[PDB]
RNA sequence: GCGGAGUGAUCUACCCAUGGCCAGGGUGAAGCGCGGGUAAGACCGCGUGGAGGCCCGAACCCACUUAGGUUGAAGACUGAG
RNA sequence: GCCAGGCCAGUCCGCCCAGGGUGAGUCGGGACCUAAGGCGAGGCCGACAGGCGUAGUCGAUGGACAACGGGUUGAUAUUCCCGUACCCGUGUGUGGGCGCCCGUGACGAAUCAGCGGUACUAACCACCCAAAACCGGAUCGAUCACUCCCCUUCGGGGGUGUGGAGUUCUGGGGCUGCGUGGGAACUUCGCUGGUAGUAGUCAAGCGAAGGGGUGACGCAGGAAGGUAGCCGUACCAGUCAGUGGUAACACUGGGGCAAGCCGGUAGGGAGAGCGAUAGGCAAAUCCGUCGCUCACUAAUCCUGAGAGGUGACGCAUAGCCGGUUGAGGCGAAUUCGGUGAUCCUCUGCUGCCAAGAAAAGCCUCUAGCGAGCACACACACGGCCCGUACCCCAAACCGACACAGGUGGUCAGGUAGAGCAUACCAAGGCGUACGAGAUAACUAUGGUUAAGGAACUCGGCAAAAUGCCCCCGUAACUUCGGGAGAAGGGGGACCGGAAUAUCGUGAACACCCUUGCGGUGGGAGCGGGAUCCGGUCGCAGAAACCAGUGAGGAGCGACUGUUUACUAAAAACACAGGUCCGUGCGAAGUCGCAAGACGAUGUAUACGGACUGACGCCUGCCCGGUGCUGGAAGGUUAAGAGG
RNA sequence: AAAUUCCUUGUCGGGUAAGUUCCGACCUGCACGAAUGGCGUAACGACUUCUCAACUGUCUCAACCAUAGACUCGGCGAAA
RNA sequence: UCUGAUCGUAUUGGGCAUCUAACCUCGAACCCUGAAUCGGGUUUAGGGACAGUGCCUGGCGGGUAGUUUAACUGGGGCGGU
RNA sequence: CAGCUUGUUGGUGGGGUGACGGCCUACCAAGGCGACGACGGGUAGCCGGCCUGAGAGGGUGUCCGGCCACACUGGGACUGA
RNA sequence: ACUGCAGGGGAGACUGGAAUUCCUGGUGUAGCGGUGGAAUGCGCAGAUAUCAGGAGGAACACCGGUGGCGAAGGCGGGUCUCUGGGCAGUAACUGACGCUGAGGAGCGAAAGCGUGGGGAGCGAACAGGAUUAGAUACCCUGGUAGUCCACGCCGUAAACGGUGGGUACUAGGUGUGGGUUUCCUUCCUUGGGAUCCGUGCCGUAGCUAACGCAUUAAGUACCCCGCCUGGGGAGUACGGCC
RNA sequence: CGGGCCUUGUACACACCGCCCGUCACGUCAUGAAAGUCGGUAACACCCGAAGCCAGUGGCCUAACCCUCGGGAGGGAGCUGUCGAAGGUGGGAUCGGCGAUUGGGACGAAGUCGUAACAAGGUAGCCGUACCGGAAGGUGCGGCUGGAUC
RNA sequence: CGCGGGGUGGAGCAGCCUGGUAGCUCGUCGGGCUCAUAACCCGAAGGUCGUCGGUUCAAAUCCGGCCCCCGCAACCA
């Protein structure tokens, strides 16, 4: 699934790339495409709020359907598996029997041509979308909602899944990819299966220019700055920072979650 | 030098949208064909193909060395590399 | 014009004075469209000042949209004039065509009477249970009343059999009900006659709200087919350049012309009918989706460079006449090849990953409007605002200067050459603003140098050297790609011959045919390249200009990259790779008092921060100190409560 | 004995006619040391450093030629 | 009768649990709306007297700010005073 | 010591020799040798014989006899049966 | 070839329960743990113990053996899917198609290596305690890689029967696994006999230096292959291949 | 503590007051690596190329043969060309010697440190592998009996 | 050179600013245990407290002077 380049140049020695063997129809669906423009990590004030962003190839947004609420009982057929520059997972184009086109995140094992169902009366097969009440415990799911009707938020990256632990009264227990136990309403929805393209994390980008294409600008270590620029700056030779490590704005390392956040009631165990 | 209120990104730093430009040579990746090899394979030899922060080299962009300039042709340049 | 300016002078001038000079339906912009971004009705937020933003409206560097060739002035010309085109709108005629009322064809319901659903379901049936109650068996316990038996301190145990409230298991009736499915009607449904072909609808044209399609998009790489251009050439018109030859093809010049329209080639691209319809907020014959029949190699349609015709009975031109050297008049031939694009077919094709605007415009669908419309020809008209002179790699711009600096795009000839390098030239420009002399030292910029050859110097700094095409040949080491143009060598000019198809490109005259912009053979003329053999010349054949020095051992950084504009380009920064910490989602983090924003139209294989810095082998011990993470037994500790 | 070693031109070997630099070692580490990473490493470098071939006015040791100044004449005509 | 432990009313305080109606929701639908991912209102789905905010109060706080950091001295620094 | 070979392997026409022959040459074809050890490295004149041994074997090549090679080192031809 | 037969032979997918550890909650109070004896350690902030619920990984008690299958290494929770070999019977078919096998290729315990995941228990390294003259150990308390999974590499073991493969022949006795088979066919006995293929013990001839082997040869013979030539140096250096 | 009988293991027989392993220190011998350095051998590519054969040319010389008496034929000297030994240049291959320093090996006396193996050798031992440790070795995983147990 | 720390039994270390009494481990000697040696056990012994010169009734101790040893600094041109 990962193809390795031959060491023809210094910049392709250890590099690797997807084989793109799951991809059909290398062009997108014209009516589901909206424009994007880069922002260079600049907010509404025009200032850099996120460093190390900018440059990179031009992209077009593809409308992914994260609700899957209005087509319960209407079946769909997978037409194409396509490339998507906005996420690590591939996306599937669905032809609903009523004649509507939609993108969903392609699960693992959703070859072109398979049929896909939604609603409480759907089989437990990869690509089906059900309320959590209807999914048996011990099942791998993805694209889970945090609130009923809020859209899929959890387990959308490539290779991700959520393991449904159990349903007690009106709450389901989930083990999320980070490994922490959360509790959600059983009226939330999820798609059955694991997100595909699970091998993409083994890609070795060979050179700096390849990351510039994906839109990351170079990152300067704070220890080779001047004291005016970073708390780690200064020194005659090279140093380790003359103090305990801190952020560029002087914040020390440590937990940054709000201690009295309103969602603590839904967190069973913090990640390890 | 300190404070208050304003002016500046037509220079320069970075970013955003939209256009344009890069003579001529060389090398020969993946893939794909053919033949060999086998039970099938790996693998091998040829073709095709034209990859690459690839090579030599004008425009173009730089500024490493040296000589000249140093009340300059020029408040940072010229010649030769 | 000449007293300032111009680095001298000046009769000249980008200087000074007066007058004149810029002509657009089509060029570049607006009146058309939107991108990043700006402003922003209400709005939200903010003590005030104000911040941000929705609807909206601006905003090209992009999209859409109609003109070419010649002539003319001292100064403008795709603008004026001539010839020939194209685009939008207006009016008036002529002609046929389709419409409404009319009429007219197509479609076409609706009420009330005949059966099942047994759909509905009072009851009923099948099933299990409380199978209620109750009749009543067995199991357990220290109660317990009767009778058989016993000790005593006189109150009860045991032998306790029976039952009593009896625990439990559990036998039968299982009425009454639970539940399911069959399951009475009226009530909902459909069929036939049936209101009746009745009500009603549709059938000119426009539709711009709204739906849909298109518009609509990356980078790299060619090939094939063409054309511009360029070089020859039939043919035409001329020359004798006072030199040894040269009298006509020996030499010189010409050997032309657009948009538009016609045309449909090379090359590309495309299934069509019928039905149904949850979707495209309403609707839809459109789009989407599904199904059937046929075709599926084809036919047909679209598209499309080029060739060809017209444009052109015109314009232009070599030259010749007359010629204040100004304006004028006449004006020949114009065929066939080669080479060849950065241009065109091509918004195509192939490959790749990094996955490559929007809106208008155009087309279509219906909502709707609708009694008059659409069409052909002819004629006559309307085509608005701004720019247009001149410089524009510069003496007219940015540099205080008529300043060796800087300034985006388009075009771009010949011979040699791989080439937009380089040399010399064409078209066309220019000699640019102090000069004239003179063999001083010395400085600068170039050139040559006997013998030696780094002895110079901090240091081979600078210079010298190598350098091209073709052919042999090429090491350690290696991450198997490299190193490598390693190193080191050999050939190179001209003439003749092989050589008349030597070979390879294109392919004229002449050979068939589904007759065409067709095919096959054919090989002319015109160009390309290499070899072998023989000869000739010089000191030298890469000929001038142009054009790698190579090898070896260490250190640092893996590598390409970036940096102190103006003394530091590096061993510094970055980098792919690694590890740790944080973050469960208007997340963490950052900008903001806040709202709001970015993160991200992302979701732990993700994002932020920290350190290390390709790859290989590895990364040992210490938790005492200070941080970080967790905990809460104890000690100390604020306001508040208490008083 | 190091981009780290003061003593110090440590000592031994190699290279040179002669080597405070260079290469290989020794360990007596003033004061190396494992992600402020340790030790290596093919390729790469207008990096630093040492050696060789070729070549040369860098040098022994200079000489000559041409041009722009300098110098002379006419014009204009500053500066610290 | 320290009455230590215990009774029933008060009264209020402290946890603890539940509720919904304040309040919250960048969950959803509809309307203002003709064009609206803003805003507001209506309904619903949740959370919930918590959170957020005001006043008071303790901690932490080179993130930022204002400042201080002696003199003598056979120059100053180090030493000493 | 695992790949060696381009007059190399074969053919045709010529040349050359006392004689066949890539012995030589022009052209044509693409063969030839190799694990039964090609190519390479080490050593060595070979034999009748001699020494040993029950024999088979092992060692050896000196006197004598046969053959080969050479004549200071390398190359070349001439004269001649 | 047909018909039967036995089997932890192999691969994949799903799935079960006991137990250990941890987490949550209840009860509960001062010890637990460990040894030759102790200490380190855990706990009093509520441990060990006990009860209920949950998570997760690994190994599969009884069956179970001396027994089975596989070329060897190896193979046992269950079910399903796919798949290899063996034996017996028949004698239907082919008609010597056989054996061995230099080089070569494939498979090949464990440890180890790479990339990714997982991690209960165990446990190199490491730390503390104890013992000891010392204790880089044995014993104790912890504990990382690893052990597990996917996909590759590695190619070695006292990889052993310390016994290469094929074939024929040479007393028996006695167990056990898989068939077939008359007769005694009920003597129900699933006993006896006969025959074929395994796997053990004991024993004659024969062999052996002896120990022992002995129809499963280390006996009697034939075919092919590998290997040995005193002990060290040394399965090491150099060269090469991976 | 000592003794007796039987049985078991043994690498002991000077008979456990036995045998025996590995570092370290001193000495000797042989050998591997090493910046580099000194020799030998056989080739290869190219440059230059003597003699000589062969092939050409050959105005200079030439008795026999021919002649029309001028010469002709034929020959030679010289010259050119292929091949060509020796030599030169270059990059490799291969066989040895030395080499500061460094790795192990063997043998030495009556040196130092432990006690790994042989008995259940005092923790059964060996095999493969990995990590660790002054050293014999230890520990983990798997294996074997060439060990024990009822 | 400046500054601050040290010198105690054969060796490694306490005791010292507190002036009145020098101790611990290993070592050494003798005795046990052993065939003998280690290891183990028992009993002992051993010191001008770097020198000198001061305060003091009294100094290892307090203070100055020299001697060795160690550590930290010797900087700006
Ligand atoms: Mg702003
Ligand atoms: Mg970042
Ligand atoms: Mg960085
Ligand atoms: Mg810095
Ligand atoms: Mg700054
Ligand atoms: Mg700071
Ligand atoms: Mg710092
Ligand atoms: Mg620093
Ligand atoms: Mg430092
Ligand atoms: Mg660090
Ligand atoms: Mg100011
Ligand atoms: Mg501003
Ligand atoms: Mg190029
Ligand atoms: Mg290929
Ligand atoms: Mg490049
Ligand atoms: Mg270049
Ligand atoms: Mg430029
Ligand atoms: Mg720069
Ligand atoms: Mg200079
Ligand atoms: Mg000067
Ligand atoms: Mg310069
Ligand atoms: Mg330059
Ligand atoms: Mg004047
Ligand atoms: Mg003047
Ligand atoms: Mg307002
Ligand atoms: Mg605004
Ligand atoms: Mg806007
Ligand atoms: Mg506009
Ligand atoms: Mg524009
Ligand atoms: Mg003009
Ligand atoms: Mg006109
Ligand atoms: Mg698009
Ligand atoms: Mg072409
Ligand atoms: Mg003449
Ligand atoms: Mg002509
Ligand atoms: Mg349709
Ligand atoms: Mg035409
Ligand atoms: Mg104009
Ligand atoms: Mg003009
Ligand atoms: Mg202009
Ligand atoms: Mg100017
Ligand atoms: Mg200028
Ligand atoms: Mg040119
Ligand atoms: Mg040029
Ligand atoms: Mg010129
Ligand atoms: Mg003069
Ligand atoms: Mg010279
Ligand atoms: Mg010379
Ligand atoms: Mg030199
Ligand atoms: Mg010198
Ligand atoms: Mg000198
Ligand atoms: Mg130089
Ligand atoms: Mg030069
Ligand atoms: Mg070369
Ligand atoms: Mg090289
Ligand atoms: Mg000559
Ligand atoms: Mg070159
Ligand atoms: Mg080194
Ligand atoms: Mg150095
Ligand atoms: Mg670098
Ligand atoms: Mg490194
Ligand atoms: Mg480069
Ligand atoms: Mg600078
Ligand atoms: Mg540089
Ligand atoms: Mg510089
Ligand atoms: Mg930097
Ligand atoms: Mg936040
Ligand atoms: Mg993490
Ligand atoms: Mg960190
Ligand atoms: Mg770094
Ligand atoms: Mg990084
Ligand atoms: Mg580093
Ligand atoms: Mg570390
Ligand atoms: Mg610590
Ligand atoms: Mg700590
Ligand atoms: Mg701690
Ligand atoms: Mg804390
Ligand atoms: Mg050293
Ligand atoms: Mg150092
Ligand atoms: Mg030195
Ligand atoms: Mg030198
Ligand atoms: Mg030097
Ligand atoms: Mg050195
Ligand atoms: Mg360091
Ligand atoms: Mg570190
Ligand atoms: Mg290093
Ligand atoms: Mg660079
Ligand atoms: Mg550099
Ligand atoms: Mg003068
Ligand atoms: Mg509150
Ligand atoms: Mg509060
Ligand atoms: Mg602070
Ligand atoms: Mg401050
Ligand atoms: Mg102040
Ligand atoms: Mg002072
Ligand atoms: Mg002083
Ligand atoms: Mg030949
Ligand atoms: Mg022949
Ligand atoms: Mg010999
Ligand atoms: Mg014999
Ligand atoms: Mg000879
Ligand atoms: Mg002699
Ligand atoms: Mg000779
Ligand atoms: Mg004779
Ligand atoms: Mg002869
Ligand atoms: Mg498996
Ligand atoms: Mg656990
Ligand atoms: Mg508990
Ligand atoms: Mg418990
Ligand atoms: Mg037969
Ligand atoms: Mg075999
Ligand atoms: Mg074999
Ligand atoms: Mg294998
Ligand atoms: Mg393993
Ligand atoms: Mg592993
Ligand atoms: Mg490891
Ligand atoms: Mg792993
Ligand atoms: Mg354990
Ligand atoms: Mg342990
Ligand atoms: Mg320990
Ligand atoms: Mg073996
Ligand atoms: Mg085994
Ligand atoms: Mg063996
Ligand atoms: Mg056998
Ligand atoms: Mg046998
Ligand atoms: Mg048997
Ligand atoms: Mg024997
Ligand atoms: Mg036996
Ligand atoms: Mg035997
Ligand atoms: Mg070995
Ligand atoms: Mg080796
Ligand atoms: Mg007796
Ligand atoms: Mg014995
Ligand atoms: Mg020795
Ligand atoms: Mg050696
Ligand atoms: Mg000759
Ligand atoms: Mg040596
Ligand atoms: Mg042992
Ligand atoms: Mg022992
Ligand atoms: Mg022991
Ligand atoms: Mg033992
Ligand atoms: Mg250990
Ligand atoms: Mg072991
Ligand atoms: Mg074991
Ligand atoms: Mg300094």
Numbering used by the authors: 2 to 273
Task: Give verbatim excerpts from the published study on this entry.
Here, we report the discovery of a series of macrolides called sequanamycins with outstanding in vitro and in vivo activity against Mycobacterium tuberculosis (Mtb). Sequanamycins are bacterial ribosome inhibitors that interact with the ribosome in a similar manner to classic macrolides like erythromycin and clarithromycin, but with binding characteristics that allow them to overcome the inherent macrolide resistance of Mtb. Members of the sequanamycin family bind in the same pocket of the ribosome as erythromycin. Like other macrolides, the sequanamycins bind in a narrow part of the peptide exit tunnel at a site that lies between the peptidyl transferase center and a constriction in the tunnel that occludes the lumen, near ribosomal proteins L4 and L22.
Methylation of the ribosome was accomplished by growing Mtb with subinhibitory concentrations of erythromycin in the culture media, and methylation of the ribosome was confirmed by measuring the shift in the IC50 of the methylated ribisome compared with the unmethylated ribosome. The cryo-EM structure shows density for a methyl group on the N6 position of A2058; however, there was no extra density indicating methylation for A2057 or A2059.25 In addition to the extra density, there was a significant movement of SEQ-9 away from A2058 in the methylated ribosome as compared with the unmethylated ribosome. The distance from the N6 of A2058 to the 3′-hydroxyl oxygen of SEQ-9 is 2.9 Å in the unmethylated ribosome and 3.7 Å in the methylated ribosome. The distance from the N1 of A2059 to the oxygen linking the ketoallose group to the C5 position of the lactone ring shifts from 3.4 Å in the unmethylated ribosome to 4.5 Å in the methylated ribosome. Despite the presence of additional helical stem-loops in the 23S rRNA, a comparison of the crystal structure of the T. thermophilus ribosome with that of the cryo-EM methylated ribosome indicates both macro-lactone and ketoallose groups are located in the same pockets. However, the 3′-hydroxyl is shifted, compared with the T. thermophilus structure, and the 4′-methyloxime of the ketoallose protrudes differently in methylated Mtb. Despite the observed shift of the 3′-hydroxyl group, a hydrogen bond is observed between the hydroxyl group and the N1 of A2058. The repositioning of A2058, coupled with the fact that the sequanamycins lack the bulky dimethyl group adjacent to the N6, eliminates the possibility of a steric clash between the methylated N6 group on A2058 and sequanamycins. For the methylated Mtb ribosome, SEQ-9 still showed potent inhibition of protein synthesis (IC50 = 0.075 and 0.065 μM for the methylated Mtb ribosome), which suggests the methyl group on N6 of A2058 does not reduce the overall binding interactions between the Mtb ribosome and sequanamycins. Also, unlike T. thermophilus, the Mtb L22 Arg90 equivalent, Gln100, does not form a hydrogen bond with the mycinose of SEQ-9.
